[PDB]
Design a binder for this molecule. Structure first.
Ligand SMILES: Nc1cc(Cl)nc(N)n1
Ligand code: NI
Ligand code: NI
Length: 330
């Protein structure tokens, strides 16, 4: 029921927040893991917007209201939560810092906000679920159901009194940024990823890819959104392994719901099929993450460390399968 608004207490605090010095250099790296710094997450987001877009990109008060209200519109679900939002935004920051001039000031502001907002009000249910059991959302949004919902929630937050960080933009630029943000959130539907990646791969291989071609730009941005959304697979193995427990915790709760409604879930959502997870992650890396980061690296060479990390994690899942796992804490 409705869109949640942060307290004066919340946003004034973030305004007064300052980032410990040692973290400045860390935040720049692809592999950086926000995990051990929970109190600082909203502040790390300020810092990234200020570094990428400049301290004058947004009136700070409205930026701070926007971020903390964004936080309050994430749910307490094991995975599609506030921590994932900031993780995704950080990956985008590393991509943009490493490819800064390829992207307009409008694209950078739009994309960091899109990443932070891309799973707003996620309920711990997949599009598969909502469409299977005809949730009202599936009727409103026949395809990319939750993603269209996340964009809707983003616009609602902006429309809160004192939250509209895009107000100072020309009328034309405003429409462009909302369009940037809409396309970027929609692209985080993995259903679209398969065709997008295949197109981009084709365009790269034939040499037709042209970044001054809007339709090409939209697709590159789309794959960037995929890379950022899946970035848990690009971290150090223990970090990757730990996040995966959260991914599966959320899936298995969905599977539990399906069982009550007389449908056996897919194995991935079946908590009594845990022995199949390492092989499922192997399949997910083979069909999704590997090709994603491969293509992204061809298009944006400086993103190559995301790909090497993901190949290292693939190998770690293969070790698990062979029975060579050593001690893991969770
Ligand atoms: N977003 C996801 C989904 C699955 Cl099955 N696995 C990973 N690593 N990330
Ligand atoms: Ni999503
Ligand atoms: Ni996501």
């Amino acid at each position: 029921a409705g869109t949640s608004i942060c307290t004066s207490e919340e946003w004034q605090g973030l305004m007064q927040f300052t980032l410990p010095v040692r973290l400045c250099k860390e935040i720049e790296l692809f592999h950086f893991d926000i995990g051990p710094f929970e109190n600082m997450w909203p502040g790390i987001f300020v810092y990234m917007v200020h570094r990428s877009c400049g301290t004058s990109c947004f009136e700070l008060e409205k930026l701070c209201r926007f971020i903390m209200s964004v936080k309050k519109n994430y749910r307490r679900v094991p995975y599609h939560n506030w921590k994932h939002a900031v993780t995704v935004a950080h990956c985008m920051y590393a991509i943009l810092q490493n490819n800064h001039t390829l992207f307009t000031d409008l694209e950078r502001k739009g994309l960091l906000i899109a990443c932070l907002c891309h799973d707003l009000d996620h309920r711990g249910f997949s599009n598969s679920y909502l469409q299977k059991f005809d949730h009202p959302l599936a009727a409103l949004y026949s395809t990319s159901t939750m993603e269209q919902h996340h964009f809707s929630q983003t616009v609602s937050i902006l429309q809160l009194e004192g939250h509209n960080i895009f107000s100072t933009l020309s009328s034309s630029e405003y429409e462009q940024v909302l369009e940037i943000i809409r396309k970027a959130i929609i692209a985080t539907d993995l259903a679209l990823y398969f065709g997008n990646r295949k197109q981009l791969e084709e365009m790269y291989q034939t040499g037709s890819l042209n970044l001054n071609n809007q339709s090409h730009r939209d697709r590159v941005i789309g794959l960037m959104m995929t890379a950022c959304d899946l970035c848990s697979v690009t971290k150090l193995w223990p970090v990757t392994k730990l996040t995966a427990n959260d991914i599966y915790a959320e899936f298995w709760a969905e599977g539990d719901e399906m069982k009550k409604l007389g449908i056996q879930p897919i194995p991935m959502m079946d908590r009594d099929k845990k022995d199949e997870v390492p092989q499922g992650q192997l399949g997910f890396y083979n069909a999704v993450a590997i090709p994603c980061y491969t293509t992204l690296t061809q298009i944006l060479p400086p993103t190559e460390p995301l790909l090497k990390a993901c190949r290292d994690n693939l190998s770690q899942w293969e070790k698990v399968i062979r029975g060579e796992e050593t001690a893991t804490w969770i």
